[PDB]
Amino acid sequence: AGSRLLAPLKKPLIVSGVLQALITLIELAPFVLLVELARLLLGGAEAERLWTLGLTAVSLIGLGAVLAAAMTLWLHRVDARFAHELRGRLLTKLSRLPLGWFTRRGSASTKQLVQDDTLALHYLITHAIPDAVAAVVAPVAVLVYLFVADWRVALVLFIPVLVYLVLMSVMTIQSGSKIAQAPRWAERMGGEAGAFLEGQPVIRIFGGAAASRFRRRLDDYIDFLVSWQRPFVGKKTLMDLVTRPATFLWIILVAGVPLVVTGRMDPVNLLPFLLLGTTFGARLLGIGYGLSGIQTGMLAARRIQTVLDEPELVVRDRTRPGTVELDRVSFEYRPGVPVIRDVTLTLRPGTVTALVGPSGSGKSTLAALVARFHDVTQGAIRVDGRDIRTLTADELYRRVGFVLQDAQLVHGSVAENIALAEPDAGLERIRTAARDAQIHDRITRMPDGYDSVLGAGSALSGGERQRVTIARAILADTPVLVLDQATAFADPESEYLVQQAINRLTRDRTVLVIAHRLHTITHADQIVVLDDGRIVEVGTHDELLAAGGRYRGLWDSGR
Amino acid sequence: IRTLLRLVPAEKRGAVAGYAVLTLLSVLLRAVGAVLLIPLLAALFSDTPSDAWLWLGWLTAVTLAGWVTDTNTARLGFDLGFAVLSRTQHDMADRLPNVAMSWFTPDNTATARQAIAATGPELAGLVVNLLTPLIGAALLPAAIGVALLFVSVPLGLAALAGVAVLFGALALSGRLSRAADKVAGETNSAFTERIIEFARTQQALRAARRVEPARSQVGSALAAQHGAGLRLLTMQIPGQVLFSLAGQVALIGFAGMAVWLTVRGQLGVPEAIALIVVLVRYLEPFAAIADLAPALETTRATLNRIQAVLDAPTLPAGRRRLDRTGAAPSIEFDDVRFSYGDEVVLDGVSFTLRPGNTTAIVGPSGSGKTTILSLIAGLQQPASGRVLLDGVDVTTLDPEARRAAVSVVFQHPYLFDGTLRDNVLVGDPEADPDDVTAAMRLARVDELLDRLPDGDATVVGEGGTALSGGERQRVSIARALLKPAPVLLVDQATSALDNANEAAVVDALTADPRPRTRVIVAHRLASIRHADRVLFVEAGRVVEDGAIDELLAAGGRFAQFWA
Numbered sequence A: 001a002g003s004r005l006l007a008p009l010k011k012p013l014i015v016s017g018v019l020q021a022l023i024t025l026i027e028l029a030p031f032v033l034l035v036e037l038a039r040l041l042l043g044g045a046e047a048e049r050l051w052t053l054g055l056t057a058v059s060l061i062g063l064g065a066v067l068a069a070a071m072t073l074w075l076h077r078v079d080a081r082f083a084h085e086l087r088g089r090l091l092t093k094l095s096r097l098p099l100g101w102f103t104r105r106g107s108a109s110t111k112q113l114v115q116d117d118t119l120a121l122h123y124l125i126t127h128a129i130p131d132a133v134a135a136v137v138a139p140v141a142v143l144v145y146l147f148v149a150d151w152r153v154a155l156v157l158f159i160p161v162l163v164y165l166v167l168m169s170v171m172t173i174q175s176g177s178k179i180a181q182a183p184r185w186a187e188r189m190g191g192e193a194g195a196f197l198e199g200q201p202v203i204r205i206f207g208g209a210a211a212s213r214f215r216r217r218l219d220d221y222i223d224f225l226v227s228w229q230r231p232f233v234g235k236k237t238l239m240d241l242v243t244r245p246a247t248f249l250w251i252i253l254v255a256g257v258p259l260v261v262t263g264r265m266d267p268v269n270l271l272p273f274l275l276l277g278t279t280f281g282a283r284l285l286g287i288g289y290g291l292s293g294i295q296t297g298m299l300a301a302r303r304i305q306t307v308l309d310e311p312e313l314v315v316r317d318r319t320r321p322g323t324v325e326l327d328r329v330s331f332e333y334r335p336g337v338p339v340i341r342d343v344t345l346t347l348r349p350g351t352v353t354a355l356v357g358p359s360g361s362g363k364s365t366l367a368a369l370v371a372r373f374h375d376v377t378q379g380a381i382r383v384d385g386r387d388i389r390t391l392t393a394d395e396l397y398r399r400v401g402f403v404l405q406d407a408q409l410v411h412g413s414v415a416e417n418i419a420l421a422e423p424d425a426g427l428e429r430i431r432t433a434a435r436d437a438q439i440h441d442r443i444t445r446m447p448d449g450y451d452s453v454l455g456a457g458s459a460l461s462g463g464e465r466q467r468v469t470i471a472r473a474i475l476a477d478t479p480v481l482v483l484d485q486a487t488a489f490a491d492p493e494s495e496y497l498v499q500q501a502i503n504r505l506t507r508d509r510t511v512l513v514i515a516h517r518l519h520t521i522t523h524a525d526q527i528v529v530l531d532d533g534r535i536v537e538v539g540t541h542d543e544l545l546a547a548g549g550r551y552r553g554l555w556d557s558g559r
Numbered sequence B: 001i002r003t004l005l006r007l008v009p010a011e012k013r014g015a016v017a018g019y020a021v022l023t024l025l026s027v028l029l030r031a032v033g034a035v036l037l038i039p040l041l042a043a044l045f046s047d048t049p050s051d052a053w054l055w056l057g058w059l060t061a062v063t064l065a066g067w068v069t070d071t072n073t074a075r076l077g078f079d080l081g082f083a084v085l086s087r088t089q090h091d092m093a094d095r096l097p098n099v100a101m102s103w104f105t106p107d108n109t110a111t112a113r114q115a116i117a118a119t120g121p122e123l124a125g126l127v128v129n130l131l132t133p134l135i136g137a138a139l140l141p142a143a144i145g146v147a148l149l150f151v152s153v154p155l156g157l158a159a160l161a162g163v164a165v166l167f168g169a170l171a172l173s174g175r176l177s178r179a180a181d182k183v184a185g186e187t188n189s190a191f192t193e194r195i196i197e198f199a200r201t202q203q204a205l206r207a208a209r210r211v212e213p214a215r216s217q218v219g220s221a222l223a224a225q226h227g228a229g230l231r232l233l234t235m236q237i238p239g240q241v242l243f244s245l246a247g248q249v250a251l252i253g254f255a256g257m258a259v260w261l262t263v264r265g266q267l268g269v270p271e272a273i274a275l276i277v278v279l280v281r282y283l284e285p286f287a288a289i290a291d292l293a294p295a296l297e298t299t300r301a302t303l304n305r306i307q308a309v310l311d312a313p314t315l316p317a318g319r320r321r322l323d324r325t326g327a328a329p330s331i332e333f334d335d336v337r338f339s340y341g342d343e344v345v346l347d348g349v350s351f352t353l354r355p356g357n358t359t360a361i362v363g364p365s366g367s368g369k370t371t372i373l374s375l376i377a378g379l380q381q382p383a384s385g386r387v388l389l390d391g392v393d394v395t396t397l398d399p400e401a402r403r404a405a406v407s408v409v410f411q412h413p414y415l416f417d418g419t420l421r422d423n424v425l426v427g428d429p430e431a432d433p434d435d436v437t438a439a440m441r442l443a444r445v446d447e448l449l450d451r452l453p454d455g456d457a458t459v460v461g462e463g464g465t466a467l468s469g470g471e472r473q474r475v476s477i478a479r480a481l482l483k484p485a486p487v488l489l490v491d492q493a494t495s496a497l498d499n500a501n502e503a504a505v506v507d508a509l510t511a512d513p514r515p516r517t518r519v520i521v522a523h524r525l526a527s528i529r530h531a532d533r534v535l536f537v538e539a540g541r542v543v544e545d546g547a548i549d550e551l552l553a554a555g556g557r558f559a560q561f562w563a
């Protein structure tokens, strides 16, 4: 599907082909004039004509160089703009795919798609058509001219041409499968490198470099690269030798010297072959080296278009405040593997709902379904009576705030992390949000204050980054708040303080709390026990204790 | 080019010398074959054209020799490129686990990612694709100019004067676009890091509505990358124009000297006609170097990143070892002081943990109790003071003896993308199935194997993202328990577990058959029931310590902590 992706570039590509045909003819023009200059030199022409021909040939060389440079510059600008707009399209597309796409693919695959696949289209849309047009125009024009000159010496020029064609075909056939396998290997190596960098504590404690799968995969990938590039480079170098101007000149002279000797040919008739017979080999080698780039670009275009055609979280056209309802919701991350089984639940304003249960029961995925990171398999999730599939991302996420179980921080200042949902928020808002989340004092102790960057190696403790994300959710200030195991890394005192701050802030809001520390959720208006992906009992703390069910078992285990 | 010779393996130096010799031979053969046309065409246009047979024979010999030399140069360049690739990548893989944690800034992380990402066919084909054609093109017109001295001294001098402007243009081409290429590389690296962040942090960015390009950081990075790339395209024009003008000046000098010698009668007309072809051969390297100029700067950036990773400061180490056969050692802190940058983390912390006992470390968030475990494990080294394992300073231990002593459960469990059993087997890849089953049962991973459809063959995502928090936490606990180390460091290993799993795992950690010196960190009182001793860490100093009953009865900070 590389024709559908590159359809916007039809007119530039056709224009580049036509202009390259003209530029190739202009670049061949000086050597015809040099052939005439040599013929006039042998005939002892007057200095005027010789100066005219020489100056015209030099000026035509300069003109051809300038035109080639201009076409290359224009075509590279066209390629850069196409890459930029295609990358923008890919970033727009990924912004509304299901999160399962990301979880299945990984960060390395996303990086490969957005950067390396778009970069792999460069040869196809910048050099391929010009190289093909040059490699067709120059050999054909030169060979017609030389056959008109002398067919006997022009026939031996087919020998290197036919050898080159056979080498090019064999190289393409031999390397076709390895080019297909190459992007998979690059994605695997990027993933292994990313895991090696991210899992450095695990690597250091458990086995170091020797036992790491990164080293084994690195060896396997170097083996693949050698098995790919050894015969490929061998064919590439043979093609360089066969098409080289020295080779053509030597073949021309081996054919012509025995003809000039013995009188079968006039030596003046060798001048076209000496001056033009060696010009078209490089243009042939251009496509010969380019056929791999064409395959790479077509495969990259296929991958890009396949991602652009992927089904996404479309906003339906169907089209109490603060209420979240789940109506017989079911969900499966993978087909035939249910994780949520016909869950019905209602969250109302001014109430706190505690969602508890065994680890792995499906609390985080229920929260992710409310976020519409995935679409429910059955049922519907309605916020203020409107199905979330009818809301836009902006409308949905202005209404529901989320503190996720993993405390993800972006590369930037602590202010930029706290103000992630509202980047144009005042520093006073950021400071009061941090004070509510019990992280203002720590930030004040940092060297740069609120401008200190949160990158790799400049991290915080687990509780501190958790409180940063809690401050982010506080600053977002949505009518509905979903707290996914927040305060899990918090000590009891800071946990109590941030919980009191949240209770003060979300007193009239809809709050969903996921907790394993059941002692922290005894004051909830409603407690929902999620076991094996379904709600098994609902009630208050005292009611669930008196019921003597799953909740009583978990409570007894906790004490 | 000395940076590349630095990266060559020591056993491959003979191949580099042979490659240099054969490259010089290839250039000399090409230059001689170009200039041999002048005698050949002078003889072919004379009254005795049969004199061209000798020069045609010499041309055939030089051409066949050039074919053989260039094939061998290609083979040697391929071998050198892949040997250098293997050596550099293996060196970076071996060095990175030993590099200090402070080195891994976001810039250094990006540099290391790029250096590892250079493993593809572009860097491996460095010698064949860049150095061989660059050296051939740079030296060819010099070799032609030298070979023309045997035809005419002033003509060879004119050719060499053309080579002078060739080298001047080649030197000046880099300067005219160094800044643009540097900015382009920086913005490309920033875009790569923002793409990786965009993929990893997708949920939080979507919830924050920071996911569209107009509002995302990756969108800003894309805009900056595009602007820098356009600027690089514009700023590469002066170098191309400079190479073109150098070629035109060399053409003017060569052709003018040839015409002057021809009209003066010192050069024959057939020799001038052959010199047209020699001039065409002479000017081809001018365009080749112009084509190769950007690749030289790209290769320079790549090798700079690789050398930056190879120059990273490796942690201090030694050669000591623990004598006993994996017996539980004592853990001692001796005036240990640690700081992240200028922020002090530990203030002269001193304690001794008896061999084989279970110790608990508790305290507020940010008090340094993860730093204590990292110092015990050797992930971090003290700024001053000593960490001793059985009386042996950890900094003086061999790296293999150091890691073989400690197994760790980290606060934020990280699993590698793969099967669940592969992640558990990281603790001990040689463990028999019974030991792996025991480790999984102790960590309550056996529940997952029946709940999940694929069992222990379940594909874990990047990190443990295809599992829940408690599931990946239990998998990491199984990994830590599988390792037969005499020291076990537990860092809030029940944070993501419900009460039943928490109690089961807490009992299992104490019920591990082998003797270990166990240090536990937890914010739950129920997670430290089996702790013989407790350390209360606050603001980087041990406020109090003792037994749980003693500390509870004391009514100190420990009692207020759980109040």
Ligand SMILES: Nc1ncnc2c1ncn2[C@@H]1O[C@H](COP(=O)(O)OP(=O)(O)OP(=O)(O)O)[C@@H](O)[C@H]1O
Pocket: A457, A458, A459, A460, A461, A462, A463, A464, A489, B340, B343, B345, B364, B365, B366, B367, B368, B369, B370, B371, B372, B411
């Ligand atoms: N990479 C780092 N760079 C700078 N400071 C850091 C880094 N990692 C941790 N710190 C700081 O070290 C101090 C102690 O960190 P540590 O991780 O040991 O805390 P902790 O007691 O384990 O906390 P928690 O209970 O929240 O997990 C904190 O102030 C944290 O800000």
Ligand SMILES: Nc1ncnc2c1ncn2[C@@H]1O[C@H](COP(=O)(O)OP(=O)(O)OP(=O)(O)O)[C@@H](O)[C@H]1O
Pocket: A100, A103, A333, A334, A339, A358, A359, A360, A361, A362, A363, A364, A365, A366, A405, B465, B466, B467, B468, B469, B470, B471, B496, B497, B498
């Ligand atoms: N991306 C995913 N792909 C496949 N399965 C997944 C994915 N994320 C979660 N699961 C599975 O979904 C089930 C429930 O996961 P979830 O994270 O919702 O549980 P949880 O109740 O929040 O767990 P915990 O309390 O341990 O955090 C688990 O079996 C987990 O393996």
Ligand SMILES: [Mg+2]
Pocket: A363, A364, A365, A405, B468, B469, B470
């Ligand atoms: Mg979860």
Ligand SMILES: [Mg+2]
Pocket: A461, A462, A463, B369, B370, B371, B411
């Ligand atoms: Mg910690």
Ligand SMILES: [Zn+2]
Pocket: A076, A122, A126, A127
């Ligand atoms: Zn290009």
